[PDB]
Write a protein that binds this ligand. Structure first.
Ligand SMILES: NC(=O)c1ccc[n+]([C@@H]2O[C@H](COP(=O)([O-])OP(=O)(O)OC[C@H]3O[C@@H](n4cnc5c(N)ncnc54)[C@H](OP(=O)(O)O)[C@@H]3O)[C@@H](O)[C@H]2O)c1
Ligand SMILES: [Mg+2]
Ligand SMILES: [Mg+2]
Ligand SMILES: [Mg+2]
Ligand SMILES: [Mg+2]
Ligand SMILES: [Mg+2]
Ligand SMILES: [Mg+2]
Ligand SMILES: [Mg+2]
Ligand SMILES: [Mg+2]
Ligand SMILES: [Mg+2]
Lengths: 327, 325
């Protein structure tokens, strides 16, 4: 698919725009500094009566409220928690928007699932780098960058493509490569990856592997080593050179064993269950549950977290890790 | 479950031994160099006209035939590949093992499944570092170490635990913590780990996640990022704190997602299939298939590798990594 670099982007565009970053978390923090270094006048939008308000002042940024910053700005980047964002839009952002203002996102959930429905004459786009804030910043500071996806949901003027590229270009994403995509595509691929593989599938794989060994009479500490601790080597190797590279660098016994037993654990029915996970994301089932959980005071998530992290691999992992930081 | 440290180990024990390292690959080169800086007389034992003989000589080691090295030595650490070990023991090691000599391994496979049966009066132990050769080497140089397992299958002398711990100290493991175990427990946990979770489970999970997105019409590169490239940050998080470090550090949507959907991916049927994989290891069936692979020319393994490697995830990732950090 497509790749855009500095030569393709027009930095003079976002340079000529007042930008408001609503949020000063990991992303907010990196964007703000990189934009500033790229020549962009930036203001942080916050509750102005906040921890962050003073951290942002101390990093050199003018700080206003969410409502005042939205009013002040031409481009509004909304980097608040996915679930706070509807309330923040309705109350503090929507009421201060001019026609021609751009409203930009790090993630497409609120737009794709219609939790935020801006007026037609507003630009809606997305800049989502592929790394956490600190890396986006560090890569930028030493003349490199982190690759970004970009997307446009509302393009009333016909300048949204160039405005989201210009932004990604200012945060260093055009150094590595900017990938145009869609709000739909970004959103469902991300939620899927998290549910099926990254968060859900991985965490349960290791928990259950730990349980099978423990229930068979092996000591928990042995189990923590062969099921979680050694996973970082494997995953570092896959990150560097893919599956082929991991398989090259382990013993042939591990490699042969991986090939026989992996598709016994992840079998055809597993693949169908993943397909159902995907349908559930695409049709809004998941997002229905997501909002239900917030609108019920975050009880389900807090209950899930409380018991799901109450696992003997977490009791055993903490003892051993505490013993290894102790050198 | 005791962790053992430098204060527990008598380093003079392995310092007073002649150590043969049979095999000079990953662990071989590192064990070898670490022992030497811990004051141990080391020799490398390689097959007739081996490629690794040049590497070992250039690194300062007396290199011998396996059989000459086995004869010279008191302690013989066997780090050739698992499927090569039985034959090497019968041809070149077994004939020079004398009362009070010790045979060491870095994995319990051959001893536990009775591929190698030493005589009564030989010490049989293991020192398995929890990390890759190069990491075992560099950690030791920078004053640190990689944790080690140790075990003892045979102990005619009463010195076998002290001897293994001495060796572990000499390669840096006691700096980081040495866990006592058994041959059975290290063998089976390692194998089940590699099969169910580390190599097998993780690679099929990412591979199958990728397919699910490509068949539903999402471009292969989006799928790659969201299924594999992002896996490192997650696993790095679990490496540092635990699962709860990971859940604390991801968005509340990511955390909520994982809780609701992870158990749909890894259900109670998965748990049973894992118990099955365990049972095939414990009863020796995995071992026979490993031996069969290599008696028929290693083609099964070569074919399974090729099948994995020509998977679009491999084409796609290679493309996307070329735009590097
Ligand atoms: O543990 P791992 O398998 O993961 O380590 P590895 O990195 O595969 O290294 C295995 C080592 O064992 C050696 N080796 C293989 N067959 C041998 C034999 N018959 N006699 C002596 N040495 C032999 C290899 O040397 P070669 O380079 O001679 O195969 C190699 O240096
Ligand atoms: Mg305005
Ligand atoms: Mg809409
Ligand atoms: Mg993600
Ligand atoms: Mg190999
Ligand atoms: Mg001898
Ligand atoms: Mg292992
Ligand atoms: Mg192994
Ligand atoms: Mg959180
Ligand atoms: Mg996400």
């Amino acid at each position: 698919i497509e790749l855009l670099y500095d030569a393709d982007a027009d930095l003079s565009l976002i340079q000529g725009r007042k930008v408001a970053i609503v949020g000063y978390g990991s992303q907010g923090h990196a964007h703000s500094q990189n934009l500033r270094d790229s020549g962009v006048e930036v203001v942080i939008g916050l509750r102005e009566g906040s921890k962050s308000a003073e951290k942002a002042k101390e990093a050199g940024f003018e700080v206003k409220t969410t409502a005042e910053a939205a009013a002040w700005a031409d481009v509004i980047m909304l980097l608040a928690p996915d679930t706070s964002q509807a309330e923040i839009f309705t109350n503090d952002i929507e009421p201060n928007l001019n026609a021609g203002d751009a409203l930009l996102f790090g993630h497409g959930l609120n737009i794709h699932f219609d939790l935020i429905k801006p007026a037609d004459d507003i630009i809606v786009g997305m800049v989502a780098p592929k790394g956490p804030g600190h890396l986006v910043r560090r890569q930028f500071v030493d003349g490199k960058g982190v690759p970004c996806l970009i997307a446009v949901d509302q393009d009333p003027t016909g300048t949204a493509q160039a405005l989201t590229l210009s932004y990604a270009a200012a945060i260093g994403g055009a150094r590595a490569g900017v990938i145009p995509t869609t709000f739909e595509a970004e959103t469902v691929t991300d939620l899927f990856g998290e549910q099926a593989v990254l968060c859900g599938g991985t965490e349960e794989l290791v928990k259950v592997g730990f349980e099978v060994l423990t229930e068979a009479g092996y000591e928990p500490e042995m189990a923590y080593f062969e099921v979680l601790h050694e996973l970082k080597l494997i995953v570092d190797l896959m990150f560097e050179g893919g599956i082929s590279n991991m398989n090259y660098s382990v013993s042939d016994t591990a490699e042969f064993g991986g090939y026989l037993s992996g598709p016994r654990v992840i079998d055809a029915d597993t693949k169908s269950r993943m397909k159902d996970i995907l349908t559930d994301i695409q049709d809004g089932t998941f997002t229905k549950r997501l909002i239900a959980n917030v609108e019920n005071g975050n009880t389900e998530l807090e209950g899930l977290r409380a018991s799901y992290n109450n696992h003997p691999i977490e009791e055993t992992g903490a003892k051993l890790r505490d013993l290894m930081s102790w050198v």
